[PDB]
Structures are given as structure tokens and as C-alpha cells.
């Protein structure tokens, strides 16, 4: 995972020991991270062709 604990949840051993890890685990599995505003279109090569997300 990414080491940004405000986006990816922390390790379960760290959640039961640290305080900031438990707070981030709570706010990530209840509310979720905040995405900056804006619009994007990301396309990959799926086996059926161009698979896009707007």
C-alpha cells in the first residue's frame, strides 16, 4: 500500500497500538478520504479494448 495513512488504511497491528493509526482507521472505514475537486478521464487497455472512467 501507499504509506500515506490518510488514504490507505494502516496495518492492523498498528491500529490496535498507535493512536493516530486508530483515528485514521476509523475515519477511513467510516467516512473515507477526501478527493480534491476536479474531473478526469482515465483509460486502460482492457482485453475487450479501451476501458475508460470519467
Amino acid at each position: 500500500k501507499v504509506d500515506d495513512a490518510k488514504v490507505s488504511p494502516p496495518k492492523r497491528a498498528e491500529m490496535k497500538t498507535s493512536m493516530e493509526s486508530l483515528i485514521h482507521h476509523f475515519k477511513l472505514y467510516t467516512e473515507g478520504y477526501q478527493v480534491p475537486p476536479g474531473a478526469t478521464y482515465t483509460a486502460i487497455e482492457a482485453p475487450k479494448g479501451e476501458f475508460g472512467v470519467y
Binding site: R12, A13, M15, K16, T17, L22
Partner: protein, 95 residues
């Protein structure tokens, strides 16, 4: 420790039991009501209180990462025993 209602129905650990005039007992006739006979309150009341020689204690529930988050319990009051918030285990300063 499951008590039996006068209608014959069993009472859950929550205390839910259908009344005598409640029609919804038609869901139980010809079948069974699923209740659990291992009550958590009675089983946690059988756990002995642990005597420790410290002012504060740390509880994680046992097993390390397989338990609850670690918390700290103060045992300054001697009249009552400090109880863990998650596991329900109670500790006491022996002084």
C-alpha cells in the same frame, strides 16, 4: 442461563420474548426459535478479578494483535475494580 416465558418460549440475552397475544408466534409453531445458551454476561461474571501491584495497568485482551486495542486502566479507587472497556476483564490493586 436461559429463562422460560409462561407461554413456553425462550428468552434471549437481550430480553426479547413475544407476548401471549402477539400473532408473530405463528412463525415459531411447527419450527424452533433459535437462541444461544451461552450468555456473555454470565460467562464474563465467572472470570476472576486479577490482583496486580501497579497503579495503572495495560490491557490488550490477550493474543497481541488478535485482541482489542490496548488501553490503560486506573486502579486508584479501592472500593470498585477497574474494568476493561472491550474485554470486560476486571483488575484490582492488591494494596
Amino acid at each position: 442461563g436461559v429463562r422460560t416465558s409462561p407461554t413456553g418460549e425462550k428468552v434471549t440475552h437481550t430480553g426479547q420474548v413475544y407476548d401471549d397475544e402477539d400473532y408473530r408466534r405463528v412463525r415459531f409453531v411447527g419450527r424452533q426459535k433459535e437462541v444461544n445458551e451461552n450468555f456473555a454476561i454470565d460467562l464474563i461474571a465467572e472470570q476472576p478479578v486479577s490482583q496486580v501491584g501497579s497503579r495503572v495497568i495495560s490491557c490488550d485482551g490477550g493474543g497481541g494483535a488478535l485482541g482489542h486495542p490496548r488501553v490503560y486502566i486506573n486502579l486508584d479507587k479501592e472500593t470498585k475494580t477497574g474494568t476493561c472497556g472491550y474485554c470486560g476483564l476486571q483488575f484490582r490493586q492488591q494494596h
